[PDB]
Each structure stands twice: as structure tokens, then as C-alpha cells.
């Protein structure tokens, strides 16, 4: 999921461009047998371009390997070109282009901004702007945060005037769908980055509780609700700490948003603020199994209101 | 049907202009919790543009919900913009605008002028002036009366030199289509809005009473007769009573033009002219069931030329 | 259509008993150079067993040839087996053998006693000695009268204390089936061969008047209604009245049953009439087209129902 | 749904035997025009068999008409079956013979049976005591209750060692399936009519909350817990009323199971428990929408499970 | 794959009997909560009779688990039947009961031999005794060895004086098949057990080095060569010295049969013979990745025939 | 396959210029009388234009022709205008017009141009002038060698540093295809033509050991690599002799690039060194059939990689 897997840069006009590879040169190079010393650089397929260093290869999927993307489909393009447009816009230099490339992000992520920019009802169709800063966010480029507005998509199953609730096609992806087929997860965005009132929360947490009551109410940190099996948070905590992990290896700045204590599922809101107090994973962990204890009547007011 | 279920007012240039929503924008609407004091405000998806007010709801098909319309098709697109452009033309005020879009029209006649709009061979396909003028009628928003040229349209069953005989296809609509599957309905138009002659009426009784016999001839009083079941003029009798009422509670103008008596069913005649004479509900349709008593021959003259 | 297009006679244990034609057979006569004294002989296959006489060729149907029948389906097997059973059921002697084989029936008749008899909700499916007797009135070997219980069959389309009507299904037929796509023709049979009311006559002329005004009630005067467009009473004068000849000319007795003036058409009554008066083909025919004057508030009452 | 719209009763071998009828029978009955005085008579349809009394013909499904059964199925013939093999084994007598056929049943708990009887891996399939225990229950002759093991049948979507848990596939019917697309309907039927314990009582109600929240556990006192829509419970409360008022003006003995109070929902137990006390319909219905106020841990347990 | 996956014991006629299982009552089962205790006992469905023991639960493919069998195929019940044959002619005592049921065995050695079976023109459809001796040694519960005629299956191949060469089908299995598309299998079986000679062996090294170059030699032991990917000896060696392990927890005998040293690949015979003069896993393993070194002319030989 | 199968000369503006041939026009000359003398003569269709002589009728498939091409698909206008483009830069003259259509090339060689031509991935598309340096080769009309990057095309299955590996679509052609369904031919290019590391040859002669041991590794001479089933080398040898005495014969250069002697197969180096040292073809043939006896460890390693 490294950017270096849809494009590569070259100074032209004296600047930083980058150009998407043809699914058919990254086929050539799934084929080719590469010196040691090459495996890091860029291949030279001959007859369609270049395409990415063959140390990605796991990347890709073949008639050996599922665990890659389907790079043959016109998604592949398509998220490509998506990733190529916005980082031209940054005139990028000799000094950072290894580091934007090199940034693994979400292909699922950049697939549902491609489905939004191609529909003619979508602002995202309408703006190139708001487009680029969707996608500037989307692979770490941006410091704003993801918004209802700039969000990855998806299909909106509830909204109100503080957040939209979007559930994520990732089943029905091109690029690199979930293979699990009970798979179900959603997203809940902030329509604006401002104070909720409690109102608008108390209408956002009952509808959780009433038509996903068998969904975990987390976050990664950056800025939105992730709706999550129970069945699947131990995941979710796994890949989160890690990622909390890397940042601190790597030095970059950990900021982990929290968000509201009254939405976000008791056991995570523990393991994600114990993660925060700088804690080993282990003892994060343990809270997310710790049967603990501590509005209302919610549950009640939906109910009656069916009946 | 209002016309605030297919566009929304926008002063732009010192006037007013109407824009058609996006299906997807009604969508989102759907799934919207919305505080009571706004259910008759224009709604924001905030991703794909504005919607109609909330308090329309039941105006959309849902997955329960069926006496709505099938606003996620083309058609749903093309009637509103057809809407728009017939709107425009008119440089609504301030002072009318709610009015107008408060208005309910049949989107069935909508959805039929489409069909005629988009046919090359159709007449409204070569005149925004006439396409206009059939629009403002089927919108209550003109005064002339719908006549052959500018008819909502259907399959031409049968034409004389003053009449145009039309099957509506209102089974086989996109938008709002008939359910009942046993549903069939005719209209005549007149060709000129003129007098007559006795032998081009004979003409359409004969047609009425071989081809039609199981057919009632009445007429809604807006100028053109419906050919419709005997087993559903008590609707129809209920639905114009309504309308009768309504307009009289809202003090517009009843014009109910009862038509020629030659050819408008007895009883149909009686509790129409009834109503005119104002009367009551109770009053009126006692005289439908009414078995009462009092051109001939036609028959007999249809079955000679058949043998 | 002669019964010795399905099957030949066998003097077999001193009895004559006969059998069904095999297709394949009747195929390798259609292609045979037959020698002229020949033309009205069975013809031996050799390989498929014996085949009906080379005259009556024109009776099949071939690659330049629709006016026959399908005798390469199933159905021409059953049809055949059904006259079979008939047939031997009466044990003909030499004298009689060519006369009834030489008796030209109706196969639609015939396939249409199949679909019943093969029906194991149809009583003729339960009796073979209703089968029987259905099967003998279909071939002119008994004198009695078609009626409700022994009927050729269809679909029935309405039922009285005294009548039932049924639907021709000639077009989906597999041997024979009529080819104009826009035919349709009805039959009423008596329940019982016995005086009927008036009342019980008023409901049958009341359902043909609103159900069936198109049509024209007449009769090939074997004791039951058929109900025609008025488009078709000419040909089906034709034919009845050739038959009309036939028998004078064969010294047949012709025993026309005009059935009940008040539900036969007047015109066809008329013709009719005049046929048994003895009468000529030109001057019966006048009639048909001789525009005349002479129950009632029928309509009227079905009409209220309705409503 | 009154038994007489499968068989009619046949005293043969001094003895009382029940037929089912023929569909196309039915078919005829529908197409007939019937005197007054007989609508409450067997009708003969000559051809097909006898027919149910016309007065019944709304339960029938026609081109105009579908809140009836689709008679013309394989299932209808299964059904009807299924009812006179029961019938027969009680040997009824002239004196109770209308009274056991006017009975009106539920055409889906007989379909379900019919289902369960022709699966070789159901008991229901080797015994035919149990399917005659069955379905005399089923028709209300018989005054054991519905077991699991009696039980009409579906897909077991959840057992215990007390109860047994039914998904209705209704919506998948051939007879009468329910036409709302957006239906779901569960049974829970007891394995044994004998006292359960807590534990095995808290484990039904653990997976009716997590499974199932929004759905209300209610009872129609026949000694099952039906689950459903809280958005139907006001149908259900309404029939359930209906039927308890009828036997109270039919004298029959009203003997309502409420059933566990720990378990059916509160308004449920409340609105039915009233009606026992025999109280007005209104008085009734006040209580499902009465919010009231008052196991535990349940939902969080089943969470940690999962987690 | 453990016997008690399809069947279970009955005492009847003072002997051991074995009952194939109901796939809905697998399928109850899997809906089921039980009482911890009870997770090693057979369950009661109920409805569709006796189930395995709720212990087992993972062996069986759900929506969350792909890991196990398509139980609710026709090849289940097949494979179940076939096992009970095999183990009623056995007539099994209280005191082994338990054992054999708790043998782990291959499902798709057992579906191998439904289809040949099944196969009128496999000998095995016409000997119920070699039928039986090939189950029984598919279930450890036989001390011959494999041979051609007693072969699981598959293609042939190849075949020789001494050997037969078969291609697992797997992929194409319903019971249990491979699920990477991949995969590739052979499975050579000696026709006889007795002294081959050294002719008829080079013809079988020949075809595997010809058609066969990119597949390792191996075997489990048994008295059968495995045609398996050189990408998948490390599995295949894992698994066998697991089952090497097992034996010697379990006391089991472990009779490892090296097979001819010729055609064994080199690094398998040693990994194996190691693992057979008592061997860590990890000293064992080494041998397979160790590169070493030590007739002949043969590719040259099958290159020429084909020119 | 001679130039003149696609298209005419035509000297206009003072140079000659080539037009393709219309299908229907080839169509209408392989249907016509032609005197003798004029087989040589371009065809006029009257209707369709010009077509090629009838003298190479043969060349076309018909009815009773399969060992043609399929003229009537798309591709023949392809590769008809292919050959025009590159035909019009030569700028031929009168001399030189009759020896350059009447020059055989190999029609699946030029569909493969198409293919890569019409790939908007390929550089051929973007590069007009490799285009027609890679057509100028590929009809006999240029010195320079094929190389990777003028290739002929096919699917990329190899590539190295120096060489690249493609496999010949030849089965799923349009215009030639080869028939026999068990065909399988590669090709191998270099990537330059100039002199390749023993390091980078190792590489491509281990993947033809491994991935291809069936194949024999042979040259026509024009200096790129064949694969090819060992079962086919003869008729290879067959017409690459053939094609050695043409150019002998009509006094044409035979320049053979013998190629690596590493790489291509003993017996082929043999029977082809023959060859050119000027021998027969007899005396060259025996060669290929001569067992012989003259890198290493390279199976060896690429075994145990995969292990």
C-alpha cells in the first residue's frame, strides 16, 4: 500500500511529476528475474514504461498471491491517476520524494474517493479542490482532518446535522476488496470539525444501539467513528498499536483523537487512552477483555417509536 | 406530486430559476433525523446538494414504502427538469414561489410529456413552444386547456377529424407507474377546442360503445373525456369530488367542464353535474348507482361492416 | 382430415381393429414416386411399417406444405391411438371399414379430447366409457349430441346451471393449430340435452352481450353454441353450408339444430333458416349482410354490478 | 382459510371421509354465475369435480384479486392432502361435519407442515402418528399444544435444551406467502411442556436480545413465543383481540397462555394479561404504547464473548 | 476428519452398528448453546435426529468458517454411508467403540472412493469386498497397504507393469476440496506389493523426471509415492513428522515405509530417514533445504522419442 | 502469405503508393471464371474494387478451404494497412514493385504487430517510427534484427536483463491462427543486440530447464530463440532448410545467426551448423535424430529455491 505502488517521479520542467504505471509493465516486472542490488529500484519493462521495484511484488496479486491488489482492472488506473494528480499539485522535491512514496496508505480509501469524484452528484465531481484535499488527507499529505465533506464515501445509512454514517462497499471493491464475506463495516464522519451539542449526540448513539447494537463503536484516531463487529476490534487493536508504534519509532508525532467518551465503546475508549499514557500492548489488550461496569433510555424511546 | 418533490427555488440574476435534485441527495434526506421545526425546510446531504423538505418523505419509494415514486431512475431526472424548464420560463416572484412548488401535479402526465419531448417524431420534439405550453398546463400553471397537440401523451388507439383517442401507458411508467396489472385507461382529446359537428361525434360514440363496451366515458371537467373500467368510476368519482371540495375550501375557481352529454356516461353526467349544482358527497354518488332510463343504430352498423 | 390419416384396419382374430400410422413412415410415403393406380393404396415404408394412401399427401405438412398437419409430434401419435380405441370399440365389418375411414373429422376436435383425457382432473381421464362416447360423437360414429361432460375441452371461461363456455385453445395447438395469431373463438355447450329456463338463458345471453359484444352467437347446428367475430361468420357460413350440400348430395340426412332463437344472432339465425328451407348459397347468404330490425336492460344490469 | 376451501366431506362405508379438491374445479366455480340461495352449496363443476361453496370464492387468488391462495400450485393439492388424511383419521359425524370445515386455520403453519412431512431427515417424514398429532393441532383439533417437535416447522436458527428457535419462511411460499418483502417472523417453541429452568431461560433470552433487539417477543397463547417486528406489534395485538373476542361470542373457552413474564415483552404482557381480565380493546391497546419503566448483563457478556 | 464427524454407535442386535448423520441435524447442532459438559456427547436435535458432539463444530463450513466440510452436500452423506458399511462388518465392541470413532482419517481419500463406487465400470462397483478392504485401510482400520486396485483414486495418468499413476482430483471434490486453484497432486500405487524390477522402475522415473521436472518424489509412509510441488515439500514434511510425533506420544507403532531410495527425492529420503532413526524436527527439516550432491541418460532417451 | 494478398500499387502523384483490399472484393474473385492468362492480373470486383490476383486463391479460406486465412474479420484490414504504411515510407519504384509483393511473411507475425499496435500501454502506439521499423522487419524490408523492442509481441512470461521471454498467441488469432489446440510456441528476444554476460545467460538457460524442460531451444536465424515442443523441431528443420536452398537457389544471401551455443539445443546447433557449412538436407536431418553426448547445477538451484 505504498504510493510507490501506483506511480513514479520525474523531474520534467524542473519540478517533481509523477505518472502512473501500466498494469502491463508491472506485469512484465512480476516476471522478471532481478540482480539483488535492484530489488529498490525502478524497472524498466521495455516495451510498456517503467514500472515499481520488484521488492513490492508481494503487492500485487497473481495466480500465487491474494493478499496483493488487482492491478489489471481499470481501478488500478484510475486510483493511480487519483494519487498522481494530487501529488503534483504539491510540486514535491528531491529531498522528500523517497518519503511521500515510500507512505503506505488505504487503496480501499483511495477507491471510494475515485467512486465519488466520477459521479456527477458528488462534489467531489464539481471541485477540484475539495478533491485534492480529500486525497491529500487520504495519503497523509494533509494535517486537516477527514470531514462528511471530505470523507472516503461509502453508502450513507444515517445522518443528522453533526455526522453522517457511511457504510464502506469495501466488498464490492475493484482494487482490493474484503475477501471475508461477512464482512460489514461503517464510518462516521463529523460534518464539521466544531463542538456537538448533546443532542445531536444523543440522536447519533441511539441509533447505534438500535440498528447496530451488535457493532463496536471505535476510531483510529484520526477523526472519525469506525462502526466494527465485536468480533473484530482485537484486530482493530492490533494494527492500531502498531501503527502508535511505528510513529514512535519513527519519531513521528502520535496524535490520537480520543473523541467523545460517550460514543466511543467503553473497553476501546481504556485501551486506546491507555495506548495514549504510552503503555506496552499487552497491557492494552487487557482492557479490551476486562468485563468492566460504569444517556439512557434510548433504547426505549426508538423502541416505542416503532411499535 | 407537489413540484417541491422534484426542484427547489435559487434567486440568481434577479429572479427566480428552479434546480432539479440529485436522487442521491433525496437519498441521504431519507436517512436524515431531522429536529421537527425543520421538516418543512429544504434539506443539505451536504454531499450531494440540496433535497426536498423531510415532510415529503412518504413521496419516495423506500424498501417499505411503495406508494411513493421511484425517484432513483433517469425519468425521475427528466420530469424534474422538464418541471424546471417550464418553471423558468415563467420569472416566478417572491411572493409566488411556494405556491407553485406547493402545488400537486400527476407525474404519470409528467413523465408521459418526456416520452413525447424525447421523440423525434413528436411535434415537442421540434417545439420548445408547444413542449412549454403542455408543460404549464400539466402544472397548473396555464390557462389554455389540453387538447390533442398538446396532450400528455400514450399509444393513438383511435383519431377522427375533432377527436384523438389515447391509451395511457401508465403500466409500463419508470417513474410512478400503475401497480394493478388489470389497470387500463383511455383519453380523448379534442383535436380543436371548437364546436363539433353531430356526425364526427357519432363517429367516436360508435367507436366508444363497439370497441370500448366495458368502458364508462366520464371526464375529470379540465376538457378531455377518460375511458376508464365501470368497476373504478367510484374512485374517480371520489378523487374529483375532492378536488371539487378542495378548490372550494381554497376558494379557487371551480371550472368543471362537463362535456358533451352524447358521450359522457348517464349517471357519470348526473353525479358530476350534481356536484357543479353543489351538492353533497352522499348526494352525488347516490345518483352512480342510480340504474336510470333514458344516436342509436351505431352498433348495429360497426357489426354489418365487421361481417 | 379423414380418419385414414391416422390409421389403417387389420382383420386380426376375425374382428376388424385398427392401427396408428407411424411419422416416420408417413415421411418415407411423402417422398415416394408412386405409380397413378397406387394413389389409393396403403403405402408400405418397408422399414417404418405401413403409411396412409399417397392421395391424401396434401394432408401433411412439409417444407412447402402449411396447410396440414404436425404429424411428426407427439400429439399425432396420441390423436391417432385415441380414433384407435374408438374405433375398435366397434368392431366394423369390411362392409363399413372404408366408410368410416374415409370420414372427415376435426383434428383440433381430436387434440383437444387428448389434453382432457390425459388430464387426471378431467373426468374423461377417470371414465373410458365417457372417453368413448366423446371420442365416437367427435368421429360422426354416434348419434349423440355433444354436451358439457363429453366436449371437446378448453378453457372454461364461464359456467351456468344450464351452460358452460369454453375457450378454443386452437392456437397453441401442437398437430393443427389455427395460424392467424389474432383468432379466437369460444364454444357453450348444454350441461344436459333438457329444456332450460329462461332465467338460466338470460345469464348466458347477458355474459355474451358485455364479456363477448365483439362476437356472434351461431351454431354448425350439432347442438352447440360457437361464439365467432362477426369478421369470421362469413367463412363458417361457407362451410356450413358446403356441408349443408354434402350431405344432400351424399343423400345424408342433414339434421340442423337451429338451437334457441333468442341467443343465436339474427342474421345467422336467418341464413340458417333458410339453408334448411332448402334454399341456395346466394340467396342465404343475402341475409348475413341484410342489415335487419327486430331480452333486454341486460347490459344495463352489468354494467351497475360493475359500478 | 376455513378447512372447506381444501375438501368436502363424503359419508362412504357409514363413515365420514374428506376429498380435496381439484384446482381447476375451483377454477370453474370462479367463472360461475351462482343463484342466491346456493352460495353456500358444494358447487359441481361437471367436468373437474366437485368445488367449494362459491361464497368462499375471496379466498381464492384471481387476475383481480390476490389476498387469497394460489390455489393452482402444487403446494394446494400437498395442503389439502395434508388436512383430509387428518380429518379421516377422527371419523367425524354428520352432527359435527360443518362445524370442523368452517373452521378457519393458517394456510402457511399447513404449508410448513407439508414441508417438514416430505423431508426424509424430518421425523414428521417417519411417523405418521407425530404428522397427524401435528397437524391436528395445526387445525384446531386437537388440544395438545405446539411443541418443537409438533412444531409447524422453518429454519432452526437457534436450540437449547428448552427451547428451539424458528426462522418462518413465509416470504418463500407457495400457497399464501407473505407478500411484504421486508417480513420476518421467528417462533420459539418449547422442546418439553414442563417446567424450565432460570439458567436455560436466560440463555433463550440472551440470544433474543443480542440477535434480536429489534424485535418484541410476544405470544398469541397457544404456548409459542412469536418474534416480531416491534413495528407490527399493533396487527398482532389487534388480530390476537379479535380472536379473543370471537370465541367469547362463539362461547368458546378462551384459554390464553401469556407465557413467561420474564421473557415476552412488557407492553405485551400487559396489553394481553389485560385481556384476560377481559377489558375493552381500547383499554388494551393503551398499554403497547404506554412507556413503561420496569436478567441483566446479558448483552454484555454476549459482547465479551465475541470480543 | 474424525470418524465421529458422520456417524454415530447403536447397540442393536447385540452388536455395534454405525448411523450416518443428518446434515440439518449438523445444522441444529451448529445453532446450538450447550452446557459445557455436554460439548463431548452426541446431540439431540430433536427434529432431524442424532448429531455429533458440538466439540467437533469447527469441522463443518458455516459462513464464518471455510476451514471445514460442505456437510449439506449429497458426497457427506455418500462418505458417511461409505464408512458404515465399512465399520459394521466390523462389529465393533463397547470397548473399541470410541476409538475408532475418534480416528482422524482423509475425506478426500473417502470421496475418492464414492466415485469409484459409483463408477459401474471401477471394479469397485462390482466387489463389495474389495469395496470394504479399500475403506478399511482409507480408515486405519486395515494393516494391507494401498495398492492400484485398492487406490483412492483419481485419474490414471500413467501406468506401468508395476505402478499406476493417479491425478488427485481435489479441486474438483464437494465434500472437502483443495481450495488454492494452484494446487496439483499425484499419487503413484504399486499394482502388487511384491519385488520390482529394476526395468519397470526406470520407466516410472523416467515419465516423473520427464512430465513430472518441477515435482518432488515423496510419501507418508504408506506404501505410495506422492507427486507433489517442490513449493510444498515443507508442508508435507511438517504434517508427516507431526504424525510420526503422535504415534510415538500415543505408543502408536510408526511403520514408515522409505519406499525405493531410486525414486524418492534425495533430500525427502533423508529428512525422512531421519525422522526414522528418532530425530528432532529441526535437525529433520535441515536435510530438505541442505543442497546436496550424489540411472541415468533417460530425459536424453524420452527427448528423442518425441523428435 | 505474399505482400500481394493485402493490397495494390498504385503510382499516384509520381511515386508508388498501396491500397488494401476490400474482403467482399477478395470474396467476388474467389467466385470468378478467369481466363488463363490472367491469373496474374489484379482482379476488378466492379462493386468492391480491386483484388488480388486469382492465382493466390488458395490463400483465402472458403468453404472447402481451411489452410488460408480468415479475410473477412477485422484484423485482415488491419494488417493490410499495417503492411501499407510501412510499404508507402519505402517509396518503392516500378523495378522494385512485383519483388516486394510478391515477398512471403508471416501473417501471425504481423497480427501481432496489430495486437501491440492497437495497446495503447505498448510504445508502438506511441512511437510510429519504431511501428515501422518493426513492420519493415517483419516483411523482409529492413536489415536490422528483431529485438525486444521491435518484437513481434505475445505475452511477456520472462524477462531478464538481457533477454525477454514471450509466449505466441498464435491459438487465439483472428486472421491465422494455428488450429491444433495442443500448440504452444515461444519466443525469445534480446533486449539488445549486442554481446550478454555468462551471468545473464545462466539466468535465461535456467528458466528454460526448470519452466520449460519439455521445449527444445532453437533459432531460424534471423537472431532470436524459438521454444518449441521437442515434438515439433522436425517440421522446424523441414522448412528453415527449405527456406536455406530458396535464398540459395535464387542466389539471395543466407545470413544464419547460429546464436549462443549454450542456449540452443545439441542436435539443432548440429543439423543447422550442417546447414550452413552448405550441406543436405538428408545428410542434416540425421543430425536431429542422433543422440549425442556432450552451465550446470542450475535445476538444482532453482529446486531448492522453490523448496
Same mark, same amino acid.
Given at each position: 500500500a505504498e504510493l510507490a505502488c501506483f506511480c513514479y517521479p520525474h523531474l520534467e520542467n524542473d519540478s517533481y511529476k509523477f505518472i502512473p504505471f501500466n498494469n502491463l509493465a508491472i506485469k512484465a516486472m512480476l516476471t522478471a528475474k532481478v540482480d539483488?542490488? #535492484? =530489488?529498490d529500484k525502478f524497472y524498466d519493462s521495455i516495451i510498456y514504461g517503467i514500472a515499481p521495484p520488484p521488492q513490492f511484488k508481494k503487492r500485487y496479486n497473481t495466480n500465487d498471491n491474494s493478499r496483493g491488489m488487482n492491478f489489471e482492472t481499470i481501478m488500478f488506473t484510475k486510483v493511480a491517476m487519483l494519487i498522481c494528480e494530487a501529488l503534483n499539485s504539491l510540486k514535491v522535491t528531491q529531498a522528500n520524494v523517497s518519503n511521500v512514496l515510500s507512505r503506505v496508505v488505504s487503496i480501499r480509501h483511495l477507491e471510494n474517493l475515485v467512486i465519488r469524484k466520477e !459521479?456527477? /452528484? #458528488?462534489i467531489l465531481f464539481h471541485s477540484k479542490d475539495l478533491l485534492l484535499k480529500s486525497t491529500l488527507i487520504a495519503i497523509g499529505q494533509s494535517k486537516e482532518i477527514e470531514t462528511t465533506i471530505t470523507a472516503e464515501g461509502g453508502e450513507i445509512v444515517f445522518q443528522n446535522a453533526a455526522f453522517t454514517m457511511w457504510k464502506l462497499t469495501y466488498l464490492e471493491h /475493484? @482494487? =482490493?476488496?474484503? @475477501? #471475508? /464475506? !461477512?464482512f460489514i463495516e461503517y464510518k462516521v464522519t463529523l460534518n464539521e470539525d466544531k463542538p456537538i451539542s448533546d443532542v445531536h449526540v444523543k440522536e447519533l448513539v441511539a441509533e447505534l444501539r438500535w440498528q447496530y447494537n451488535k457493532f463496536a463503536v471505535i476510531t483510529h484516531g484520526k477523526g472519525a467513528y469506525r462502526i466494527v463487529k465485536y468480533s473484530s476490534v482485537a484486530n482493530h487493536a492490533d494494527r492500531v498499536y502498531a501503527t502508535f508504534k511505528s510513529n514512535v519509532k519513527t519519531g513521528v508525532n502520535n496524535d490520537f483523537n480520543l473523541l467523545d467518551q460517550r460514543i466511543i465503546w467503553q473497553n476501546w475508549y481504556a485501551f486506546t487512552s491507555s495506548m495514549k499514557q504510552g503503555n506496552t500492548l499487552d497491557v492494552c489488550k487487557r482492557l479490551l477483555f476486562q468485563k468492566m461496569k460504569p444517556f439512557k433510555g434510548l433504547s426505549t424511546d426508538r423502541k416505542m417509536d416503532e411499535v
Amino acid at each position: 500500500a505504498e504510493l510507490a505502488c501506483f506511480c513514479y517521479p520525474h523531474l520534467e520542467n524542473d519540478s517533481y511529476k509523477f505518472i502512473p504505471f501500466n498494469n502491463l509493465a508491472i506485469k512484465a516486472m512480476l516476471t522478471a528475474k532481478v540482480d539483488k542490488k #535492484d =530489488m529498490d529500484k525502478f524497472y524498466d519493462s521495455i516495451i510498456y514504461g517503467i514500472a515499481p521495484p520488484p521488492q513490492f511484488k508481494k503487492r500485487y496479486n497473481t495466480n500465487d498471491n491474494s493478499r496483493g491488489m488487482n492491478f489489471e482492472t481499470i481501478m488500478f488506473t484510475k486510483v493511480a491517476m487519483l494519487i498522481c494528480e494530487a501529488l503534483n499539485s504539491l510540486k514535491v522535491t528531491q529531498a522528500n520524494v523517497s518519503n511521500v512514496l515510500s507512505r503506505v496508505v488505504s487503496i480501499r480509501h483511495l477507491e471510494n474517493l475515485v467512486i465519488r469524484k466520477e !459521479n456527477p /452528484q #458528488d462534489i467531489l465531481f464539481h471541485s477540484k479542490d475539495l478533491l485534492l484535499k480529500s486525497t491529500l488527507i487520504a495519503i497523509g499529505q494533509s494535517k486537516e482532518i477527514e470531514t462528511t465533506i471530505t470523507a472516503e464515501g461509502g453508502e450513507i445509512v444515517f445522518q443528522n446535522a453533526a455526522f453522517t454514517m457511511w457504510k464502506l462497499t469495501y466488498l464490492e471493491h /475493484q @482494487l =482490493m476488496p474484503i @475477501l #471475508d /464475506q !461477512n464482512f460489514i463495516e461503517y464510518k462516521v464522519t463529523l460534518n464539521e470539525d466544531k463542538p456537538i451539542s448533546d443532542v445531536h449526540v444523543k440522536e447519533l448513539v441511539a441509533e447505534l444501539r438500535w440498528q447496530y447494537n451488535k457493532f463496536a463503536v471505535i476510531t483510529h484516531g484520526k477523526g472519525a467513528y469506525r462502526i466494527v463487529k465485536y468480533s473484530s476490534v482485537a484486530n482493530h487493536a492490533d494494527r492500531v498499536y502498531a501503527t502508535f508504534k511505528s510513529n514512535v519509532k519513527t519519531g513521528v508525532n502520535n496524535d490520537f483523537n480520543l473523541l467523545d467518551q460517550r460514543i466511543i465503546w467503553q473497553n476501546w475508549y481504556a485501551f486506546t487512552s491507555s495506548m495514549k499514557q504510552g503503555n506496552t500492548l499487552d497491557v492494552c489488550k487487557r482492557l479490551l477483555f476486562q468485563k468492566m461496569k460504569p444517556f439512557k433510555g434510548l433504547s426505549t424511546d426508538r423502541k416505542m417509536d416503532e411499535v
